[PDB]
Write a protein that binds this ligand. Structure first.
Ligand SMILES: *[C@@H]1O[C@H](CO)[C@@H](O[C@@H]2O[C@H](CO)[C@@H](O[C@@H]3O[C@H](CO[C@H]4O[C@H](CO)[C@@H](O)[C@H](O[C@H]5O[C@H](CO)[C@@H](O)[C@H](O)[C@@H]5O[C@H]5O[C@H](CO)[C@@H](O)[C@H](O)[C@@H]5O)[C@@H]4O)[C@@H](O)[C@H](O[C@H]4O[C@H](CO)[C@@H](O)[C@H](O)[C@@H]4O[C@H]4O[C@H](CO)[C@@H](O)[C@H](O)[C@@H]4O)[C@@H]3O)[C@H](O)[C@H]2NC(C)=O)[C@H](O)[C@H]1NC(C)=O
Ligand SMILES: CC(=O)N1CCC(c2[nH][nH]c(=O)c2/N=N/c2cc(C(F)(F)F)cc(C(F)(F)F)c2)CC1
Ligand SMILES: [Ca+2]
Ligand SMILES: [Ca+2]
Ligand code: NA
Ligand code: NA
Ligand SMILES: [Zn+2]
Length: 809
């Protein structure tokens, strides 16, 4: 109940929300059906439209007008945005040459430059180039300020998850807005775009920017605008708020536009109808900047122009139907469209089985346009699993496609045709899903291009721009320092928590009873001192190029040196946490020799009690083993024996070994040839609770049968070289280049529908799908990489957030 018979007189777009049943006059009151009776009349004036004309200049104030052209309007803060242009001979902001904003030029009483977030729904990254001729205000922001060629949204690339990620710095699995539609099994409640459940605070986790600001004494404009409030009124409201007395005036504001997304759904991303929405958005930016200029704030405010996601061509004929795959389609609930999420229709149905649903959906049609995954098997870069609102079965849908349960869900009578031509929601690495970032103002750099970055990073920067301490989030604070003229955030590297042991030769061969064998009994002061030096770390400078990784948790581990590689060996997990080696451009690939095929050698530096054993592998009929440093890349026949040490061994399913062996035998050398040497760091990852974070020992669900050897859920590699590829990886003077992956350690290759073919036809495709940031691997391992480089720490933070996408231009 609302007692809608209070009044909005003097309350229009009030910033404090009044509680039920008293009536509201804030920018969201319409959405709640709660506005006072006179809200439209007083707060939503339209009379005479939005622009001054020559005949209106100097008019007697008429309080009925949408905006004012009277002499008093500047001091009232309610002129039409083009007032000084029409009436005082001033220029539009877009027509002024740009001039560097070296310092804030703010009116007296401003404590800090205000921030205005100008958010545009469905603004695909390529609109900035493709629509530049029809967006002159936006193009001036972009060319004069700081811009990225694109900004990566979070998955799913839907509106609510991305807008709340912008506000919080959190992945959707952590903030809880995991789709536009959701069912929470604990609340037994559903969240929908339409309706009232979405206003309940229990959906919305983390701490959004407006709460962070308010807690720290920085006033915030109300971020959300009821759909029916025209954009011109949104802009005039922000400009009016900026004219408030210092003690009342917010420091942070948000504008939102439902375009170009609204039209993009109807017409496709590049439909000829799309030109007009882009023109209209540019006009709104122009109104804002002209309005700021009239208030002498155009060289004071930091403006962020930012989208939530892009837009792809999708039509209803490109729909896959689950009823073409499942016999039991009526026993499931599907959240459909550009991603699929499946759960049981009824919790009382004991015949429901996700294993049989996955199998029925796996590689069933030659050009099948979705792929089913248990959520823990989704690429880790998606960070899309650790929330009870995310169903266990997920369908990753190919770009340009939909999935639906039955054809009747898609068509409507009488004709059966559908009219949409665009959609979004796909994997966040897809080019059509990329969106925009421009920052313009005294705190941003001048005429500066920055590399693409993820929208999870922006919360930290918005906190920096407002002098706020960010709540804990998934950004890497400092990684966007290169966007900023000032207010940079200068973090210190985390402290190493566990220091390594450096064991020497402590055990005799006969102390080991591991059931291993090796034909190595094959027989010099010259060369013997040489081998001893390698074991003491004489080659470590070649193979550990950026320092040893730091271990950020409490554990017991050993550093082990060899001719061709260095490793940090865990006495708790019985395998390396990391193995580091450099392969030059000139390196040669060799085979595993016949006499060494089944060779595993005890490591006399590490006790039998802290070693794996071969008998476990012999007894475990599902599990084989691989090596982290590849024997194929040994520098000499003699050095190759090091690669067969039990301390270089890791558990691997035979199916996974196909992947691994191809990576090690073929792809590493290929990358070294292409990149002028590579440094490789590889290792295991244990994430049995799929929370994106390193498992402790007591979270491990699977061991090599009969043993205490834990089975990794994933294997990673970080592959680093010189950004200037004219310099070899091991003699690089300047910035670095990296690509990494986190491959799922699966006992089958069902994910790869072409896996019966030669590995040259499917393995690299798998690896691209599972591309990763170094930062993802840090979370998953508790290691901190690149500790010793010549580079600035912020530069290294940027490097650690890099994702190699494998998408064309
Ligand atoms: C991305 O960045 C974020 C932010 O930094 C990272 O997320 C953090 O990760 C931490 C570790 O997983 C986690 O810390 C836990 O906090 C628990 C208290 O949590 C509440 O309070 C905080 C603070 O205000 C709040 O943020 C939380 O909000 C979550 O939960 C509500 C639901 O109430 C949601 O609305 C909200 O969206 C958010 O949900 C997300 O996180 C939860 C986990 O907290 C998930 O379950 C959801 O799926 C969703 O992802 C909470 O309201 C605290 O209880 C935990 O402590 C337990 O574990 C420690 C280990 O140190 C142990 O010592 C304790 O004893 C305790 O164990 C006891 O409880 C266990 C569980 O019942 C039980 O098994 C034991 O036997 C014990 O009894 C823990 O410290 C922190 O909450 C989140 N924060 C957020 C905002 O998500 C995230 O990791 C980053 N991602 C990556 C990949 O880096
Ligand atoms: C129909 C639809 O698809 N809907 C429902 C209406 C909703 C909407 N209408 N009017 C608005 O102003 C607005 N959202 N504005 C923001 C802006 C930000 C930002 F400033 F950070 F960018 C964050 C958020 C938050 F949701 F994440 F909280 C919301 C848009 C999604
Ligand atoms: Ca959107
Ligand atoms: Ca974990
Ligand atoms: Na075996
Ligand atoms: Na397969
Ligand atoms: Zn949309």
């Amino acid at each position: 109940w609302t007692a809608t018979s209070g009044s909005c007189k003097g309350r229009c777009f009030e910033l404090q929300e009044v509680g039920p049943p008293d009536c509201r006059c804030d920018n969201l009151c319409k959405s709640y059906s709660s506005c006072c009776h006179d809200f439209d009349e007083l707060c939503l004036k339209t009379a005479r439209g939005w622009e001054c004309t020559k005949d209106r200049c100097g008019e007697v104030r008429n309080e009925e007008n949408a905006c004012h052209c009277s002499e008093d309007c500047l001091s009232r803060g309610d002129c039409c945005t083009n007032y000084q242009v029409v009436c005082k001979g001033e220029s539009h902001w877009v027509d002024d040459d740009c001039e560097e904003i070296k310092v804030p030029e703010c009116p007296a009483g401003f404590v800090r430059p205000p921030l205005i977030i100008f958010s545009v729904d469905g603004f695909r990254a390529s609109y900035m180039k493709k629509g530049s001729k029809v967006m002159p205000n936006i193009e001036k922001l972009r060319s004069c300020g700081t811009h990225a060629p694109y900004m990566r949204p979070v998955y799913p690339t839907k509106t609510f998850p991305n807008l709340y990620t912008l506000a919080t710095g959190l992945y959707p699995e952590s903030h809880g807005i995991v789709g536009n539609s959701m069912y929470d099994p604990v609340f037994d409640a559903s969240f929908h775009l339409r309706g009232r459940e979405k206003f309940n605070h229990r959906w919305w986790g983390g701490q959004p920017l407006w709460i962070t600001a308010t807690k720290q004494g920085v006033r915030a404009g109300t971020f959300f605008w009821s759909v029916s409030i025209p954009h011109e009124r949104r802009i005039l409201t922000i400009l009016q708020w900026l004219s408030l007395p210092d003690n009342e005036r917010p420091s942070v504001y948000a504008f939102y536009s439902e375009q170009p997304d609204f039209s993009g759904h109807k017409y496709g991303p590049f439909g000829p109808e799309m030109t007009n929405p882009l023109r209209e958005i540019d006009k709104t930016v122009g109104q804002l900047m002209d309005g700021l200029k009239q208030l002498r704030l155009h060289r004071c405010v930091n403006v962020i122009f930012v989208g939530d996601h892009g837009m792809e061509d999708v039509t209803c004929d490109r729909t896959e139907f689950l009823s073409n795959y499942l016999t039991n389609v009526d026993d499931i609930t599907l959240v459909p469209g550009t991603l699929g999420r499946i759960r049981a229709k009824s919790i009382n149905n004991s015949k429901y089985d996700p294993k049989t649903i996955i199998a029925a959906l796996t590689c069933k049609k030659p050009d099948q346009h979705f792929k089913p995954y248990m959520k823990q098997h989704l690429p880790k870069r998606l960070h899309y699993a650790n929330n009870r609102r995310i169903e266990d079965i997920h369908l990753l849908v190919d770009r340009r496609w939909h999935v639906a349960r039955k054809p009747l869900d898609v068509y409507k009578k009488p004709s059966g045709k559908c009219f949409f031509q665009g959609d979004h929601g796909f994997d966040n690495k897809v080019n059509s899903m990329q969106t925009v970032f421009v920052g313009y103002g005294p705190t941003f750099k001048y005429r500066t291009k920055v590399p693409p970055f993820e929208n999870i990073e922006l919360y930290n920067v918005m906190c920096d721009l407002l002098g706020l301490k960010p709540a804990p989030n998934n950004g890497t604070h400092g990684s966007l320092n290169h966007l900023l003229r000032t207010n940079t955030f200068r973090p210190t590297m985390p402290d190493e928590v566990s220091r390594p042991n450096y064991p020497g030769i402590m055990y005799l061969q006969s102390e080991f009873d591991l059931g291993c064998t090796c034909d190595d009994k094959v027989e010099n002061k010259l060369e013997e001192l040489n081998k001893r030096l390698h074991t003491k770390g004489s080659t470590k400078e070649r193979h550990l190029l950026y320092g040893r990784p730091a271990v950020l948790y409490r554990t017991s581990y050993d550093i082990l040196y060899h001719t061709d590689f260095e490793s940090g060996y865990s006495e708790i997990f019985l395998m390396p946490l990391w193995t580091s080696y450099t392969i030059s451009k000139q390196a040669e690939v060799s085979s595993i020799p016949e006499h060494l095929t089944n060779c595993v050698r005890p490591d006399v530096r590490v006790s039998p009690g802290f070693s794996q054993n071969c008998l476990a592998y012999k007894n475990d009929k599902q599990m084989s083993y691989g090596f982290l440093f590849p024997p194929y890349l040994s520098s000499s026949p003699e050095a190759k024996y090091d690669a067969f040490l039990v301390t270089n061994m890791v558990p691997m399913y035979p199916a996974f070994k196909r992947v691994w062996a191809y990576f090690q035998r073929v792809l590493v050398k290929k990358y070294a040839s292409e990149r002028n040497g590579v440094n490789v760091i590889s290792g295991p990852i244990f994430d049995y609770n799929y929370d994106g974070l390193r498992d402790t020992e007591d979270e491990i669900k699977q061991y090599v049968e009969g043993s205490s050897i834990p089975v990794p859920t994933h294997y990673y590699s970080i592959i680093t070289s010189c950004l200037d590829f004219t310099q070899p990886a091991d003699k690089c003077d300047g910035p670095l280049s990296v690509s990494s992956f986190i491959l799922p350690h699966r006992p089958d290759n069902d994910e790869s529908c072409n896996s019966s073919e030669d590995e040259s036809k499917w393995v690299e495709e798998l690896m691209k799908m599972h591309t990763a940031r170094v930062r993802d691997i840090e979370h998953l391992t508790g290691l901190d990489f690149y500790r010793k480089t010549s580079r600035s720490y912020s530069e290294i933070l940027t490097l650690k957030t890099y994702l190699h996408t494998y998408e064309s231009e």
